């Protein structure tokens, strides 16, 4: 006998994200074999963990993947990155590209610096991560007051720096209209501890490549669409 | 995946008697306790079996719960009731009140007579039930030709008379537009066999209360609504 039904108030609604399937109109079809394929990946997080380039400003306001250092120790940071997957300096990194499609993140961030100066050039940098609450660090004295690591140049070329996940909330927003205590998390600044030092016949300016990616315990969640723009 | 359904041709129909329930909008609610209560009954048949009064006509055409008898034996019945739960004489009995809400009946009918004359009054009545087919009984000779019981007055005051269920059909209609062989079933007439007899100083007229109810094997079926009327 026919079954009595109660048609819910949302009849005919198309839910773009319902966790259910629809009617197959061309079934019993074999998906062209691809067992020979390589390079498959199943988690978008894999991408977030690949270090990609940060865009630093040129003296002509042009974007470049590195910053300059020379035989002196400025009283101000060589570069300053606000920790937000929204930071304009990392806008084109794979990390940011993926994060733009998720609502929240949690976990470590890895800032990779690669020294590209000559083999005869030496020097030390102090990479600092300052949590918010008291503003951006104004001096080396202040920057050292927070989380930091001293990077000494030598045989090994790069330094893998981790911005620890320090937050009042378990998850943080990947973007925002106005900065809030849940979407902006401090600054990463790199200072010149000792001047870059070298012998004669060596260019005065050394270039340090800068990259970012999610760390070991980094995660993203809540698939969303980012503010659209016109490519150019 | 969504289930394919075939919407029947009666979509949206409200069936007043569907044997199914609808949506509870205030569940998990306790029905105010009533365990202290008494007098509960679960079957409407219980009511049908309670003897209630028949309306007999006065000499002034007024309705009364009894009939008169005296020191004589009329050649005609003292009272005549057509066996139909539609009979106007039983229109206000509980039996008829309940039967008006059902389509058919089956089983015994109990006609109870209570002698209310003085203790010094004696006499005998012949209560007869005449099945149809040959019309109403015109004489005592005819009335005795059918189902009957002789009621002798004395210590016990009442007589419980049963109109046997004699029918061509298993069930009979409780009402009708025009009488049919399935809605009208004969007559119950009570005759004076011997005259009411008594000593001096006793009123000549004795009153016999008359009541009706369903018998032991009486049943009703098919809930319906009776022809509406304006109370007055």
């Amino acid at each position: 006998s026919p079954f009595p039904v109660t048609v819910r108030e949302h009849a005919g609604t198309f839910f773009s994200t319902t966790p259910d399937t629809t009617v197959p109109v061309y079934g019993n079809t074999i998906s062209t074999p691809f067992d020979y394929m390589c390079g498959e990946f199943t988690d978008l997080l894999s991408l977030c963990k690949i270090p990609t380039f940060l865009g630093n400003l040129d003296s002509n306001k042009k974007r470049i993947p590195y910053f300059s250092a020379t035989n002196s120790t400025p009283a101000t940071p060589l570069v300053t990155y606000q920790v937000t997957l929204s930071c304009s300096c990392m806008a084109n990194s794979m990390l940011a590209a993926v994060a733009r499609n998720f609502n929240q993140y949690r976990g470590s961030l890895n800032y990779l610096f690669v020294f590209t100066g000559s083999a005869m050039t030496k020097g030390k940098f102090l990479i600092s991560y300052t949590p918010p609450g008291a503003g951006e660090p104004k001096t080396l004295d202040q920057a050292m007051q927070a989380t930091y690591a001293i990077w000494d140049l030598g045989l090994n070329s790069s330094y893998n720096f981790t911005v620890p996940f320090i937050s009042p909330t378990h998850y943080r927003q990947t973007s925002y209209n106005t900065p809030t205590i849940t979407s902006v998390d401090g600054w990463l600044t790199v200072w010149q501890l000792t001047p870059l030092t070298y012998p004669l016949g060596v260019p005065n300016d050394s270039h340090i490549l800068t990259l970012v990616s999610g760390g070991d315990d980094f995660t993203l969640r809540m698939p969303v669409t980012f503010t659209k723009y016109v490519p150019q | 995946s969504p289930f394919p359904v075939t919407v029947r041709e009666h979509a949206g129909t409200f069936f007043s008697t569907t044997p199914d329930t609808t949506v509870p909008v205030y569940g998990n609610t306790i029905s105010t306790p009533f365990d202290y209560m008494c007098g509960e009954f679960t079957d409407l048949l219980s009511l049908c079996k309670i003897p209630t009064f028949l309306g007999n006509l006065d000499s002034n055409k007024k309705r009364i719960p009894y009939f008169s008898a005296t020191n004589s034996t009329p050649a005609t019945p003292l009272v005549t009731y057509q066996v139909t739960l539609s009979c106007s004489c039983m229109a206000n009995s509980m039996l008829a009140a309940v039967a008006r809400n059902f389509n058919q009946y089956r089983g015994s009918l109990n006609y109870l007579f209570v002698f209310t004359g003085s203790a010094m009054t004696k006499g005998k009545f012949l209560i007869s039930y005449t099945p149809p087919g040959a019309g109403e009984p015109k004489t005592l000779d005819q009335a005795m030709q059918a189902t009957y019981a002789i009621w002798d007055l004395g210590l016990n005051s009442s007589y419980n008379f049963t109109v046997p269920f004699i029918s061509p059909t298993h069930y009979r209609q409780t009402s009708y537009n025009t009488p049919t062989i399935t809605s009208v079933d004969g007559w119950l007439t009570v005759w004076q066999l011997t005259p009411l007899t008594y000593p001096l100083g006793v009123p000549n007229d004795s009153h016999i209360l008359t009541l009706v109810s369903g018998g032991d094997d009486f049943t009703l079926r098919m809930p319906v609504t009776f022809t509406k009327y304006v109370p007055q």
């Binding site: 006998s1 026919p2 079954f3 009595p4 | 044997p19 199914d20 298993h170």
Partner: peptide
């Protein structure tokens, strides 16, 4: 005749059909 649904009737048999009874 003319009933060919494999799942049992939603309404009980007493309600879906009149109840057959023998008087003897």
């Amino acid at each position: 005749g003319n009933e060919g649904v494999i799942i049992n009737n939603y309404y009980s048999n007493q309600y879906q059909n009149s109840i057959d009874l023998s008087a003897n």
